[PDB]
Amino acid sequence: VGSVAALLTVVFYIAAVMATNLYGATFPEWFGDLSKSLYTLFQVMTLESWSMGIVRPVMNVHPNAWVFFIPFIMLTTFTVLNLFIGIIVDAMA
Amino acid sequence: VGSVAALLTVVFYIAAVMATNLYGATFPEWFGDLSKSLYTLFQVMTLESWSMGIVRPVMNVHPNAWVFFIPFIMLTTFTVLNLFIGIIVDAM
Amino acid sequence: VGSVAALLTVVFYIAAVMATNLYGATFPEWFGDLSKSLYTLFQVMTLESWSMGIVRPVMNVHPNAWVFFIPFIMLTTFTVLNLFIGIIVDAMA
Amino acid sequence: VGSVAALLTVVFYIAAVMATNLYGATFPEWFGDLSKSLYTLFQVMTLESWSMGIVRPVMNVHPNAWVFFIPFIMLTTFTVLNLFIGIIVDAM
Ligand SMILES: [Br-]
Ligand SMILES: [Br-]
Numbered sequence: 001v002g003s004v005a006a007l008l009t010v011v012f013y014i015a016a017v018m019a020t021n022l023y024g025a026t027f028p029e030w031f032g033d034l035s036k037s038l039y040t041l042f043q044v045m046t047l048e049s050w051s052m053g054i055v056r057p058v059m060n061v062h063p064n065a066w067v068f069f070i071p072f073i074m075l076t077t078f079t080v081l082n083l084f085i086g087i088i089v090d091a092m093a
Numbered sequence: 094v095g096s097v098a099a100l101l102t103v104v105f106y107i108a109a110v111m112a113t114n115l116y117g118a119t120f121p122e123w124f125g126d127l128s129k130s131l132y133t134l135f136q137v138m139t140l141e142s143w144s145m146g147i148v149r150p151v152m153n154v155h156p157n158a159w160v161f162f163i164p165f166i167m168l169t170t171f172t173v174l175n176l177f178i179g180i181i182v183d184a185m
Numbered sequence: 186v187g188s189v190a191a192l193l194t195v196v197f198y199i200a201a202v203m204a205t206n207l208y209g210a211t212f213p214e215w216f217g218d219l220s221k222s223l224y225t226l227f228q229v230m231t232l233e234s235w236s237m238g239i240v241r242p243v244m245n246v247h248p249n250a251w252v253f254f255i256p257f258i259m260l261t262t263f264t265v266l267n268l269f270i271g272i273i274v275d276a277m278a
Numbered sequence: 279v280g281s282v283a284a285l286l287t288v289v290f291y292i293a294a295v296m297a298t299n300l301y302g303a304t305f306p307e308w309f310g311d312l313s314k315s316l317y318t319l320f321q322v323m324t325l326e327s328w329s330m331g332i333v334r335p336v337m338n339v340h341p342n343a344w345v346f347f348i349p350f351i352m353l354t355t356f357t358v359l360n361l362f363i364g365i366i367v368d369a370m
């Protein structure tokens with residue numbers, strides 16, 4: 001369980017570093033700095049306006065932005081689910 | 094588990110082929126080509142603006158568009174859940 | 186499992202009948218007829234624009250519309266989850 | 279199971295008291311009174327327009343509003359899930 005939580009944090013920071021680099025200059029309110037990026041990627045992970053609100057406006061400038069977000073969503077919005085189930089199963093003793 | 098992942102892919106491509114045909118000419122930014130369609134159907138599967146953003150504007154032109162999306166959502170947003178649980182159970 | 190699916194259908198139709206009556210005259214594009222209502226309540230069950238898109242505009246005219254939707258969300262967005270888990274557990278033999 | 283449901287209610291009312299205090303004067307339609315706050319925090323817990331609709335407009339006035347909502351979302355959108363699974367397991 002602790003190994004899963006460590007994997008997600010390392011993945012979250014690297015993704016937020018990557019996103020700052022890629023879309024910070026063109027979408028500064030969303031990826032302008034690591035802090036803005038970590039907040040956006042959490043919102044993207046929770047799926048709130050991920051497409052209409054974020055990815056569609058982003059993809060308009062970066063046609064292939066989906067190569068980052070779609071797998072990023074597939075990984076985190078699976079790992080979080082796996083982690084949360086992991087705590088629940090471990091709780092029974 | 095591998096059988097489930099294969100079923101979802103085949104279903105996803107056929108649905109995206111179908112949607113391109115049905116709503117590509119009237120909603121090209123959303124279903125204009127297979128690529129645009131696969132991206133939209135993933136967004137529809139995650140449920141982001143599926144109604145207000147997609148299905149409601151679509152249904153305005155195609156009154157019965159719900160006959161495609163509602164079952165499509167019912168299938169994928171069940172199979173993905175079944176697949177993800179399938180990996181978790183198999184891991185132990 | 187079959188008993189759960191029957192309970193949800195009966196609940197869905199009665200809720201959609203109730204909603205047509207309550208908010209059909211003031212919000213016809215959303216609850217104007219049983220068909221429009223069943224489509225809206227599914228969208229509300231999936232949680233797409235349930236508040237900003239539906240309940241907030243509705244509550245503006247019917248201040249207590251939350252007494253219908255909040256429990257309706259609590260019931261269906263629990264029963265569907267319980268039904269889907271029910272099929273998964275029953276599949277193993 | 280009953281202990282979990284009690285923990286969530288106590289957490290929900292305290293969070294809604296806190297939010298009324300913090301953002302009621304600047305965002306009254308959203309946190310103007312405990313009732314408005316409890317309705318908003320449920321909508322935030324379901325994740326409907328939590329960022330674009332609520333937290334982003336809020337953070338514009340309170341730059342650190344994320345210190346409240348992100349953990350609030352992390353707690354409730356875990357406890358509800360844990361509670362719902364708890365009823366399902368106890369049913370057998
Ligand atoms: Br997914
Ligand atoms: Br809920």
Ligand code: NA
Pocket residue numbers: 048049141142234326327
């Ligand atoms: Na949304």
Ligand code: NA
Pocket residue numbers: 047139140231232
């Ligand atoms: Na969702």
Ligand code: NA
Pocket residue numbers: 047048140141232233325326
């Ligand atoms: Na959502």
Ligand code: NA
Pocket residue numbers: 046047232324325
């Ligand atoms: Na959601």
Ligand code: NA
Pocket residue numbers: 047048049140141142232233234325326327
């Ligand atoms: Na949404």
